[PDB]
Design a protein around this ligand. Structure first.
Ligand SMILES: CCCCCCCC/C=C\CCCCCCCC(=O)O[C@H](COC(=O)CCCCCCCCCCCCCCC)COP(=O)(O)OC[C@@H](O)CO
Ligand SMILES: CCCCCCCC/C=C\CCCCCCCC(=O)O[C@H](COC(=O)CCCCCCCCCCCCCCC)COP(=O)(O)OC[C@@H](O)CO
Ligand SMILES: CCCCCCCC/C=C\CCCCCCCC(=O)O[C@H](COC(=O)CCCCCCCCCCCCCCC)COP(=O)(O)OC[C@@H](O)CO
Ligand SMILES: CCCCCCCC/C=C\CCCCCCCC(=O)O[C@H](COC(=O)CCCCCCCCCCCCCCC)COP(=O)(O)OC[C@@H](O)CO
Ligand SMILES: Nc1ncnc2c1ncn2[C@@H]1O[C@@H]2COP(=O)(O)O[C@H]2[C@H]1O
Ligand SMILES: Nc1ncnc2c1ncn2[C@@H]1O[C@@H]2COP(=O)(O)O[C@H]2[C@H]1O
Ligand SMILES: Nc1ncnc2c1ncn2[C@@H]1O[C@@H]2COP(=O)(O)O[C@H]2[C@H]1O
Ligand SMILES: Nc1ncnc2c1ncn2[C@@H]1O[C@@H]2COP(=O)(O)O[C@H]2[C@H]1O
Lengths: 389, 389, 389, 389
């Protein structure tokens, strides 16, 4: 598309105006050689209102410039040529519609302050006696004074000497030295929001760890609490899927979930090739859970019935005691299905070989699934009746 | 009413005192020509206590001024004429009872600091040797010094030279340079609360978008999540009606709801002209929901029964498959009524042609409505039995 | 008690040390006339460890002073007499155990900074060439420089001139100019917590009012929403009783409730003189609710049964229509009792004459009360059977 | 282990580089005697990439130094030797993996600013005319100027005099005087998080106390609310066990609970020596509760059945009236067991002699325990039948 190119070009034109117009207000020797480079940017300003896809555009586009300097209008009225700076109040919002915004906003404030400093320096250069000095060093001194005043440092090596300069510096010391604190506060607060996810996984971890270390916790447990937390930050960046997705409506949430959980989908044998309405009914009820190594899930005799679907990692099935391990299950399989099918207590124990994450599904949705969909229930039936040895 | 006029006049009088009294304390040549303009404001100060609809008013109204300058009381005791400044401590609270308060408060703090600066400058002008200089430039220099000190810039071009001036500037450098930081912090924090609604629709959108862009989401879904969010900001400003209205009591909430949801009311045929107690029983249970274009609502076979009332936009009804579209529904109509009436599963599918918002009503309130109100149930009965083709 | 007197005396002694010890470190001409006033404060320092009802006390109490100046120990080692300042690190915490703490903390930080400024000024006075000047003006100049540096104003009229002074001022410009910002930030944040209740009733009111004024709400409703809110702030200061009292345990909550709701207690005829276990069972289930004038409570035909106990204000009972008003009820009475007793729908309508607040009690606790306590049920029975006309 | 030693050594080497490299950039007379101390640190830099258990390490380890000064490369290109400072951007994160982090982070920011100040001072020393002055005082003056500028104090005693110096000081006054505010804000905010637990027990206590003191609460109740709160802070530091432990998964939560509640375990006679599956089923359902002295728990006639296990303190059993105290129970015992066993109302009253904390267990888990485990039910049966006198 070319809308990005046009927006970048408009930004370039409105920065050209911002840098140029006060500087040519101070020095009238310009605008004679820079004339050909101004008509193009002026006709590229009235051609932006038709490209709607608004009062700033109406006021700023009309060529109020190029005549103020033409008729050589005197000084108390020549300040009305400054209205071509009103594109910024819209550009700062239109540039947002393109990169993390917490980054685009951070930069826009920085340019703004470097434009305000230039404008104030050009203002201070004007109301001075005519001194036979080069223009470049005069601008350097004016900008040095403006940065000294705005930062509330105040060296005092160069200070006002006339009542007009005194009033001007009072106005600056109030206004600019207030917005510098304001903009620096905003930027300082918004730098701390570049991370967002790192901060919460750290606040949560510190909150848990302070309480754990306050008590006389053995080193072993304290080893695992910090390993799980690191695993969660690595694989999920501290995000909470549920907590994010209860802001969206139901169809958008379903569409997002069917792509987010698309890894466990087409992995287990019994989901793919089993219709498209079952896969929509069951996708929202799959919830993630993490079990670390050397940790138990089923303890062979408990109530409840919660099928567990292996996403990543290997799970090991054991008896009610340590003896006679049956087998080992891997990625894309599941276990714990006959607790509700046969109406019997748990008949085996399961551990985790490594950091394996897996999806747990409740009993109510599961027995509703059995009561509604016959052939999937039959497949579970034959798998359970075969799994008897 | 004239209470606004009287309050504005009292504000004008208490600003006249604030600007004048220290300035006439410094210069005793005044108060001779300004006498006729003082008696009116003094008699407009004792006439405010009777207009109650209070200790500041009691202390400040009594003409302690106009005698201090009369008897020409000496300097160490003449400072007791400053008590006419105690109207501000009430005026700053009484002006609130009139425009967003987050705007009225922002301005009141700005005037306060420009009054404190003037008072401090008038103070610094006093304890100086008598210099043969014009009064205007002397006030300008004093105000320049006060603004330099309060802003913590400190050029140092004009500095104290006597022990009394040194003690005065120590007092200012502590006290005023503390409240300047305090007031600027308050104003900086309260500028960010002018928006309120824009901020939350932006924090929520960034929170969702960061997680969406962290994953490998296709561009299509990412297109719709941001279109819905923009539609919600345009039509609701990011507000949450439920979340706002669970602070009010039940009768106030009902009265607010019957005006807020008054658009869907008198629009559908079966609500207006159907009593006034049904319309009170059902107004609180209507909840809004948004469905975007190309999105499904009913999938022809599901459980549940939730009638959907069309507020704005057109909804299209389809079969269990793509073939044989029945008809199209428009603004002010509804669908999905016979799921509970006939005790049958959903017999049709519905999509959205554009961004249509609609109101969903639960099954419990609906069957209670059927069990309580006979004639509305009969109207639904005849509409359902006619809608069989 | 005398513990307050002893604590105030200890504060006076530890402020005497704080003001005196660096000042006598700078000027060795003292400590000769001030000797009798030091032994008393020194023996009032070793007598505080026995009054336990602790390392700061152990280190600071031992008379390390009074010998440093005695043997006239040289300068590089005389700084070890400063350890008598270590009582402050405990006093700042012990003074809390006495007035809103948000006020006591605000003042303690202010004294701390005025002690740090004095200590730094006394430090700067020392490493100077011997100048034949009065001591008072020298201290004034040193304190002026210290306040200029700590506030980050920096006039620059008096500046370091020796390498030792340069190192000292670098140390101050880092350390003191950091804690001044720190302490001022703390004080600025904690000034805004003096109110606490005013802020929340204002944030809530603005949050509701912004949404109400965004919509096209009639002036009448907007009149009542703001009157109720003002009534709630006047009678409850914006507090939420429930929200406060679910931090306490059950017995403390019961003890607090039996005193808070003691106004409605011994007011209605049927509670006082009706045992002490019923009054404990029912005190926690009474909840407050506010109904404004011209507002309805019962609409004659609804389901539910919620007895309403009149706390303050008059309530008016009406028929199902406007005609034939029955009577008027006043403070200390109740209504709406036979909805559950006779198993009949509501037979009357009730309005509010003015801003009357009243207590609502649910149906489950009420019918449990009827099922458990016989004589109160009999009293309700006879009152209901008499109230048939 | 030796990984801590290696990490400390790497920190020492990267601080040696940070202090040395700009200082030898300014003064070329060095690097001749300091050569033997550089080769060791350079070969201790390429030996860190193999010890992985990464682009900063790749760029910084290659000996780009030691040749820039060798060939005596000119000034506009000699600045490329600064790349050996890129270890800090990793070291600041790797030092975290070792002491409360809220302390390690506080210190890392302080070193960073003292390194930035040194770098800026060394920069300012360079672009100066050659003055016949000692190097030490020149560095002292440069560092004094850098600290004056970064702190936004600005004495102005020494100021730039050349255009290059003016551009340099503009760059510093923007950049360094922005990050000084940023880092000081971060450190000021993070100092207030060293406590964490103290703050919440204080915010909660103030929130409760403001409401209690707003009402006309008697002094007696106000005495106990503050004693319980102090007891809770002493024995639990204001922590909420439940609220912390609903962030961990179920097996980690169980493992943590079986160590946290290990005090009440092996204390009561009937838990230890009663299997290992009962002790896992019941450990998560024990919840703590605190009852102060002179407070009632059971009032002899109520419904419900909640066994109470004595952790610490003595509990006293009384009749339905004051007469005929039966006995006294101590640490490690329990009461209130026959409310569900005999299906009878409460037959006794119990008070608290002192601040005794105890564990309450609900009725559903208790009757499930009775229905599942026979021998523990039999032990409760025989204890209840013996406890009949
Ligand atoms: C980045 C760095 C700053 C921007 C780039 C460098 C800016 C230009 C720097 C520059 O050349 O300095 C002077 C500019 O003079 C002139 O009229 C130029 C006057 C305007 C210069 C720019 C002023 C604003 C700088 C705002 C910086 C913001 C940074 C964030 C010229 O003297 P020069 O060095 O030849 O020595 C002369 C003699 O002393 C030794 O031979
Ligand atoms: C807005 C702008 C400031 C307020 C409006 C302008 C204020 C007045 C500005 C003004 O006229 O300046 C001087 C005031 O003198 C006098 O005695 C007047 C002394 C008091 C002036 C006001 C001081 C406080 C300003 C606080 C501003 C806060 C802004 C936020 C007079 O010299 P003038 O220019 O004739 O040149 C003389 C010669 O140098 C060239 O012919
Ligand atoms: C409150 C106000 C400040 C405290 C109270 C007033 C403090 C004392 C004020 C004082 O008397 O000033 C000088 C103190 O001199 C001396 O040696 C005294 C030196 C020490 C004075 C105190 C310094 C610290 C003040 C910290 C204030 C914090 C406020 C928050 C003496 O000159 P004096 O006036 O006779 O004129 C002389 C000539 O110029 C005209 O006859
Ligand atoms: C802690 C304190 C500061 C660090 C420790 C002390 C630092 C060194 C202090 C020092 O000795 O000062 C001068 C350093 O000179 C030199 O070249 C040394 C130049 C560099 C000194 C260090 C500068 C940065 C200090 C950054 C401090 C951050 C604190 C947080 C020497 O003059 P000296 O006293 O012999 O008197 C001479 C005459 O006036 C009287 O006989
Ligand atoms: N021999 C086996 N081979 C494969 N899977 C098994 C075997 N024995 C038990 N399982 C699985 O392990 C599960 C443990 O709990 P369930 O009894 O609910 O259901 C069990 C089966 O899913
Ligand atoms: N031919 C039709 N004309 C109008 N509305 C229909 C038609 N067919 C179905 N509907 C509506 O579409 C709804 C789809 O779900 P229900 O079966 O619950 O109820 C259905 C009717 O409200
Ligand atoms: N004539 C009356 N005198 C006093 N109270 C009444 C009278 N009529 C109705 N009430 C009360 O008003 C209540 C309205 O609702 P209820 O019918 O639940 O119970 C009613 C009584 O408590
Ligand atoms: N004489 C006694 N000796 C020991 N314990 C008792 C005695 N009488 C009552 N209790 C205990 O006190 C409890 C009070 O409530 P319960 O009746 O539920 O169960 C009671 C017993 O656990």
């Amino acid at each position: 598309t070319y809308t990005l190119v046009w927006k970048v070009w408009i930004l370039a034109v409105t920065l050209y105006y911002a840098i140029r117009i006060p500087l040519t207000l101070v020095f009238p020797s310009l605008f004679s050689p820079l004339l050909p480079l101004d008509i193009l940017a002026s006709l590229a300003l009235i051609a932006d209102i038709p490209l709607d896809l608004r009062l700033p555009d109406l006021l700023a586009a009309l060529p109020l410039d190029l005549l103020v300097f033409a008729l050589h209008l005197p000084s108390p009225l020549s300040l009305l040529s400054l209205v071509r700076l009103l594109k910024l109040i819209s550009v700062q919002a239109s540039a947002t519609r393109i990169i993390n915004p917490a980054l685009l906003r951070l930069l826009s404030l920085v340019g703004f302050i470097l434009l305000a400093a230039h404008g104030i320096a050009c203002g201070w250069m004007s109301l001075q006696p005519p001194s036979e000095n080069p223009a470049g060093t005069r601008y350097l001194s004016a900008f040095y004074w403006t940065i000294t005043t705005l930062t509330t440092i105040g060296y005092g090596d160069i200070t006002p000497s006339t009542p007009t300069q005194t009033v001007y510096t009072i106005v600056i010391e109030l206004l600019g030295a207030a917005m510098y604190g304001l903009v620096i506060g905003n930027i300082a607060s918004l730098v701390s929001k570049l991370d967002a996810a790192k901060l919460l996984h750290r606040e949560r971890v510190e909150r848990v760890t302070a309480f754990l270390s306050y008590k006389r916790i053995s080193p072993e447990l304290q080893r695992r609490i910090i390993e799980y937390f690191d695993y969660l930050w690595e694989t999920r960046r501290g995000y909470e899927e549920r907590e994010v997705l209860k802001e969206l409506p139901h169809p958008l949430r379903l569409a997002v979930a069917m792509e987010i959980h698309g890894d466990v989908i087409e992995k287990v044998p019994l989901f793919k090739g089993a219709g498209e309405e079952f896969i929509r009914d069951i996708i929202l009820h799959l919830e993630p859970v993490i079990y670390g190594p050397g940790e138990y899930i089923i303890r062979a005799g408990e109530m409840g019935s919660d099928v567990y679907f292996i996403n990543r990692g290997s799970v090991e099935v054991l008896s009610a005691d340590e003896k006679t391990r049956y087998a080992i299950l891997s990625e894309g399989q599941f276990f714990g299905e006959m607790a509700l099918i046969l109406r019997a207590p748990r008949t085996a124990t399961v551990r985790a070989r490594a950091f394996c994450d897996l999806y747990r599904l409740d009993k109510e949705t599961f027995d509703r699934i059995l009561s509604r969909y016959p052939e999937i229930a039959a497949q579970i039936q034959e798998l359970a009746v075969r799994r008897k040895e």
